[PDB]
Amino acid sequence: GSSGSSGQPPLKNLLSLLKAYYALNAQPSAEELSKIADSVNLPLDVVKKWFEKMQAGQISVQSS
């Protein structure tokens, strides 16, 4: 269940785990998102944001 108290975000390193997928899947659908999450031990919402942020050009001004 939900444990802990909203404090600080994860280590930049984590993101790296995601970048892996996004590398080939520019805009992964839900079915894929939910999955990729179970891999990074993250929910489907936390993963959705990152993507929406990257695709927009927030995570890194230099996107490919």
Side-chain angles (χ1 to χ4, degrees):
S2 66
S3 189
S5 282
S6 291
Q8 285 180 315
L11 210 152
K12 80 90 77 72
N13 288 341
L14 175 150
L15 302 157
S16 187
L17 278 166
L18 279 172
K19 274 86 150 68
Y21 297 92
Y22 174 62
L24 47 154
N25 200 321
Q27 48 271 337
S29 45
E31 292 285 282
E32 282 297 319
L33 278 159
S34 178
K35 210 205 271 171
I36 301 165
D38 178 286
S39 271
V40 290
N41 200 336
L42 284 171
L44 156 69
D45 72 81
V46 167
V47 171
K48 272 174 156 171
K49 270 85 79 78
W50 179 97
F51 276 112
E52 274 198 282
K53 270 73 199 292
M54 184 90 116
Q55 276 158 54
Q58 301 175 60
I59 301 286
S60 186
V61 63
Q62 292 164 266
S63 291
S64 288

